[PDB]
Design a protein around this ligand. Structure first.
Ligand SMILES: N[C@@H](CCCC[NH3+])C(=O)O
Length: 241
């Protein structure tokens, strides 16, 4: 169907009455397509709450993770909410909001496998393209091979199939994958490889929208909306401390 690409200021957005939100749709329980193929998750609930507070109809676009920030800067959407940890490198190309959650990257292996970064000496480590996991895997010494996947759930599948020794992913993502697939007795979560603060992105320089997102997120944090949505997905409050 195609769409009109434009980096829009908040005033232009407000004038149209709708806001375009980019996400991935392959990172359960943050953003994913459910069993009746509808987009949902923590970040989808958060984005819709933000849109509602701002008085705007949300329009969601799911696309592959590796080009979300690319297509954001090209004008495909107004902001992205797709679990991006804030990094110096990414901040050169997009502006981040205040983080909407805090989390960490974690080692996951089959029951007898690697627990610590040092255990990764000589091992095959699967990670998703363009992630902070692939960043940290490239910097852990003595890994035999970093295998990079287009989608995070496919790295998990290669771990289950015994084609890699370890999968590095988000701690909440690993937690829920194991539960929902009943792999408590087959997978083992190891140590936290790093910690990160995860934020929404807008196109480099889009301060007016950045301001409006930061104001809405603060209100959701203060008025109880954030707390309900976090409790809904995690049974705990995941905001940054
Ligand atoms: N939090 C990680 C993963 C993002 C989502 C990848 N499916 C990162 O910032 O790279």
């Amino acid at each position: 169907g195609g769409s009109e690409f434009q980096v829009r200021s908040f005033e232009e957005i407000k004038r149209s009455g709708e806001i375009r939100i980019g996400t991935e749709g392959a990172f359960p329980p943050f953003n994913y397509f459910d069993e009746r193929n509808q987009l949902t998750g923590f970040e989808v609930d958060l984005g819709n709450a933000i849109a509602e507070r701002l008085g705007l109809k949300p329009r969601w676009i799911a696309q592959s993770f590796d080009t979300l920030l690319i297509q954001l800067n090209q004008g495909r959407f107004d902001f992205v909410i797709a679990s991006h940890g804030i990094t110096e490198e990414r901040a050169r190309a997009v502006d981040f909001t205040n983080p909407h959650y805090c989390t960490g990257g974690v080692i996951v292996s089959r029951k007898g496998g690697p627990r610590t970064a040092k255990d990764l000496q000589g091992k095959v480590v699967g990670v998703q393209v363009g992630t902070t996991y692939m960043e940290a895997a490239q910097k852990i010494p003595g890994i035999k091979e970093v295998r990079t996947y287009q989608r995070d759930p496919d790295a998990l599948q290669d771990l289950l199939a015994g084609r890699i020794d370890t999968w590095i992913t988000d701690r909440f993502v690993a937690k829920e994958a194991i539960k929902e697939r009943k792999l408590e007795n087959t997978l083992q979560v190891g140590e936290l490889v790093f910690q990160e603060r995860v934020a929404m992105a807008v196109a480099k320089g889009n301060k007016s929208l950045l301001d409006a997102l930061n104001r809405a997120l603060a209100e959701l944090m203060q008025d109880g909306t954030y707390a309900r949505i976090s409790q809904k997905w995690f049974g705990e409050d995941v905001r940054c401390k």
